[PDB]
Symmetry: C4
Subunit: 80 residues, 4 copies
């Protein structure tokens, strides 16, 4: 209905587009260099530090693996 459910603060601009896991987990990169995994309730699940801004948008594999590029030149594969 367009009402805020919650907002989660990262350390930089969130240019990355979120991806949704099988359990509802939301994955998204931030310009603060981290890939974020956020629970559907808004609490952080984990965050993974890459070497540069994560402008790339994550994709989820058939086994749950999360893949995302970084401006540090790497394609990352992160376990769930």
């Amino acid at each position: 209905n367009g009402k805020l459910k919650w907002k989660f603060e990262t350390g930089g601009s969130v240019h990355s587009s979120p991806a949704i896991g099988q359990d509802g987990t939301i994955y998204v990169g931030s310009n603060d260099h981290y890939l974020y995994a956020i629970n559907p309730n808004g609490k952080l699940k984990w965050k993974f530090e890459t070497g540069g801004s994560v402008h790339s948008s994550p994709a989820i594999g058939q086994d749950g693996t999360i893949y995302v590029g970084s401006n540090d030149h790497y394609l990352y594969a992160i376990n769930p």
Copy 2:
């Protein structure tokens, strides 16, 4: 067939890529800082103001929740 169905004017460049809800609603960010929810007929459903340009492309959860990053550093979860 490549003919215009309609066009909806936001207040800034629409860099964000649209997402489609279960009922056909189209969600998209604008550089004018808003997340837009547009009905399949072209009429605005609602718009949600974040603190910065919405370059991020929205994702839709299993329960309809719309998630999108903003250049204000936040990942937003918006109720339908």
Copy 3:
């Protein structure tokens, strides 16, 4: 196997990410301001001129409608 099938020349950088229709049609924006509809064989189906660069990536609705933002501030809904 990583061999070129074909390449289709637009008038500018293709920053937009392609979307695939029910019949295999590939839709993508170009910085030349057009939304392109390309047949799976590489021949143009149609192209639609917006008012600015199409950095936004198209989405396809349940009825085939293609939606894409433009840097001209508009969200476009294009008939198939």
Copy 4:
């Protein structure tokens, strides 16, 4: 669980967002001008050189064809 599975080094910033094939292959562009095809185990499958940075995010057709734009103005269709 947020632990690194692997990271694959390209020659430039990975702004492109990855796409996942039917067999788990991960496709992604790099600013080094290549489209990469990476096996789920982290070993390169192939890489395809376009004429400019691949900021566009790949899409996969019903027959496995991978489509991606390049800043060289072209939309590419690459065989699997």
